[PDB]
Amino acid sequence: DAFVGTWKLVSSENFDDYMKELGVGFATRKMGGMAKPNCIISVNGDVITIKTESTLKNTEISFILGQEFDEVTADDRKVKSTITLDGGVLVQVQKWDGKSTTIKRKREDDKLVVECVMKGVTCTRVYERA
Ligand SMILES: CCCCCCCCCCCCCC(=O)O
């Protein structure tokens, strides 16, 4: 839709603080902090696939909107994820050990804007088409 494409990270704010709030150790934060991943979003019927590709780590999720799925995150959390579409925004929640984090993906002008929230920390990551 508005989301389908190959997207390249162009900016990131507060990502280290976000990872620290998730419990990510220093070595992994160091790897994440200057990563510039691509995000490849595709849809086939009911099923959305989001691939994240980077030099040191690739991940992939496929899901149906509103159907919970098990996910291993790039920092090796085992989470229960649910993604819905709300006013054009893809809203993902990950739940694990009584905690939660939200990742909201929205299309704004030329950009894919990703807002990641854990507790008091809000990180914003912007991608543009490859
Ligand atoms: C090897 C690098 C691993 C870095 C660990 C990052 C922690 C996972 C949080 C990812 C949030 C998704 C952000 C996005 O799609 O831009």
Ligand SMILES: Nc1nc2ccc(F)cc2s1
């Ligand atoms: N597969 C990958 N997912 C992420 C998420 C964040 C990041 F900084 C690097 C990577 S690599």
